[PDB]
Amino acid sequence: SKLPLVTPHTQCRLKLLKLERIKDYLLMEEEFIRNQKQEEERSKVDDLRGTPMSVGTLEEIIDDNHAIVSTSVGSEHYVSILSFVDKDLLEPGCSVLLNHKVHAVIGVLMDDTDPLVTVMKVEKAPQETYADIGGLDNQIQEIKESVELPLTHPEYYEEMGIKPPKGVILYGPPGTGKTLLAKAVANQTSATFLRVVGSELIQKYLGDGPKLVRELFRVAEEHAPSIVFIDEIDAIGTREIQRTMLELLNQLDGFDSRGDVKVIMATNRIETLDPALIRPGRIDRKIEFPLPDEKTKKRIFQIHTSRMTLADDVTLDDLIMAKDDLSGADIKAICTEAGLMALRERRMKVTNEDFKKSKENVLYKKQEGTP
Amino acid sequence: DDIQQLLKKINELTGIKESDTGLAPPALWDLAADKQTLQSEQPLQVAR
Amino acid sequence: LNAKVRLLREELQLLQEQGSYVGEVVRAMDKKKVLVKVHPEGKFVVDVDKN
Ligand SMILES: Nc1ncnc2c1ncn2[C@@H]1O[C@H](COP(=O)(O)OP(=O)(O)O)[C@@H](O)[C@H]1O
Numbered sequence: 001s002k003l004p005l006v007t008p009h010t011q012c013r014l015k016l017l018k019l020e021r022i023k024d025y026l027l028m029e030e031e032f033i034r035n036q037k038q039e040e041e042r043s044k045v046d047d048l049r050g051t052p053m054s055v056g057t058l059e060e061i062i063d064d065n066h067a068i069v070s071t072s073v074g075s076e077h078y079v080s081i082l083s084f085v086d087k088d089l090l091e092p093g094c095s096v097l098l099n100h101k102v103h104a105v106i107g108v109l110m111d112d113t114d115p116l117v118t119v120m121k122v123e124k125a126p127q128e129t130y131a132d133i134g135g136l137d138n139q140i141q142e143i144k145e146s147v148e149l150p151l152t153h154p155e156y157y158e159e160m161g162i163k164p165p166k167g168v169i170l171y172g173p174p175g176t177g178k179t180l181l182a183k184a185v186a187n188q189t190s191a192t193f194l195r196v197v198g199s200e201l202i203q204k205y206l207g208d209g210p211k212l213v214r215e216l217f218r219v220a221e222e223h224a225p226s227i228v229f230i231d232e233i234d235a236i237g238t239r240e241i242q243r244t245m246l247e248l249l250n251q252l253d254g255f256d257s258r259g260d261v262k263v264i265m266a267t268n269r270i271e272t273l274d275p276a277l278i279r280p281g282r283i284d285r286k287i288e289f290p291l292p293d294e295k296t297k298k299r300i301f302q303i304h305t306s307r308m309t310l311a312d313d314v315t316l317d318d319l320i321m322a323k324d325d326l327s328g329a330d331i332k333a334i335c336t337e338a339g340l341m342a343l344r345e346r347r348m349k350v351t352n353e354d355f356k357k358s359k360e361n362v363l364y365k366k367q368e369g370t371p
Numbered sequence: 372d373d374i375q376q377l378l379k380k381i382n383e384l385t386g387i388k389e390s391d392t393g394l395a396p397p398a399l400w401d402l403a404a405d406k407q408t409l410q411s412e413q414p415l416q417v418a419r
Numbered sequence: 420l421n422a423k424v425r426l427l428r429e430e431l432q433l434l435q436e437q438g439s440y441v442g443e444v445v446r447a448m449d450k451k452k453v454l455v456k457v458h459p460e461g462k463f464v465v466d467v468d469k470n
Pocket of ligand 1: 133135136174178179231266300303327329330332
């Protein structure tokens with residue numbers, strides 16, 4: 001659980017009122033909690049599992065209540081299963097609690113292994129929203145139709161008899177908002193978000209690449225409604241690395257039924273992509289991210305400078321004008337550096353000239369080369 | 372800051388969340404047969 | 420003299436108690452149960468005493 005989002009950002013008493021509303025509610029929480037049976041069930045089960053209980057691994061289930069369990073010493077024991085253990089929650093590789101004296105299975109322990117993919121499960125999408133992105137409307141509708149609508153409303157596709165699209169590639173110059181759009185769609189539909197950065201699936205170990213992608217899809221399907229993001233797919237996209245490609249392509253198209261997990265893959269060099277990975281059967285949605293135009297640039301300037309204190313003299317149009325020379329990330333860079341420049345000369349209220357010299361210096365640092 | 376500190380106070384007051392175990396629906400399981408088998412049978416080890 | 424005799428006697432009494440292991444918890448399992456990791460063996464779930 002998390003706090004509500006207070007949506008004035010200028011210092012106004014509306015922001016205050018929302019805040020003291022929240023304080024009121026949390027204070028009622030405090031009040032309520034401070035102003036303060038099944039011993040039969042406990043006396044049977046939690047006394048049968050006499051403390052302490054060891055933790056081991058389940059290998060096989062042989063009978064209805066008989067299973068093989070290994071422990072951290074590595075020994076193997078054919079033990080019985082007490083009736084209260086959920087059989088459907090038991091499978092090879094599962095962590096199981098065991099009676100200390102007689103090693104009898106006394107319950108399943110929720111998994112705490114596979115650390116790395118557990119970290120890349122992130123789920124920490126809520127920093128952005130479709131709000132934070134402006135002007136990418138065509139891309140927004142495309143990705144909504146491809147991945148967001150089938151997750152939010154698969155009813156349309158099931159009623160239509162349609163098997164939903166099962167792969168999306170995002171492409172364009174860097175800093176156009178591909179990663180931002182992926183995070184934003186992860187935020188709009190609260191399906192679990194999976195991110196893995198390109199080259200990081202390339203590994204020294206021969207198996208580790210395909211193994212890593214296999215376990216990532218395994219955890220994704222385990223979370224069921226999930227979105228997996230591979231940024232800079234080019235690192236793999238453009239024998240061992242080709243074998244990781246084959247693993248990913250078969251995880252996309254191949255045997256079994258994948259189900260609900262969606263795949264977003266972002267590239268900066270789409271034309272260098274190999275034909276196999278761009279599967280017409282799987283990857284039917286390619287979304288271009290062009291360099292922002294005048295309207296989009298204006299929207300990005302408003303979005304980013306919105307949280308900054310601004311003077312009256314700022315004429316945003318001369319910043320917007322000229323051509324499509326730069327992307328949204330460059331716009332954020334101009335906003336930030338204009339903030340610093342206003343800070344040096346001691347303005348907490350950035351002016352037009354600040355942005356003018358900021359864009360000039362950025363264009364100086366933008367590209368290079370002898371005449 | 373009161374938001375943050377009151378959140379932490381709520382968290383410490385409610386305590387940690389019960390991670391729990393298996394324990395299939397209560398009417399489904401137990402019987403004295405469970406404990407009788409536990410105290411009667413043998414936890415066999417496995418050997419090649 | 421009696422103070423030193425008494426402290427030696429009680430120290431001898433506690434000296435019979437054994438090594439008590441060393442453990443590190445990964446996740447507490449609410450009151451009592453609590454999950455711990457001990458160095459040579461694996462994970463356990465160990466009730467806590469009066470503290
Ligand atoms: N249309 C946009 N709206 C808002 N921010 C944008 C937009 N395009 C780019 N950005 C900024 O650029 C960064 C995202 O760059 P992005 O193109 O997603 O990286 P990558 O090329 O690695 O996918 C974000 O910090 C974001 O603030």
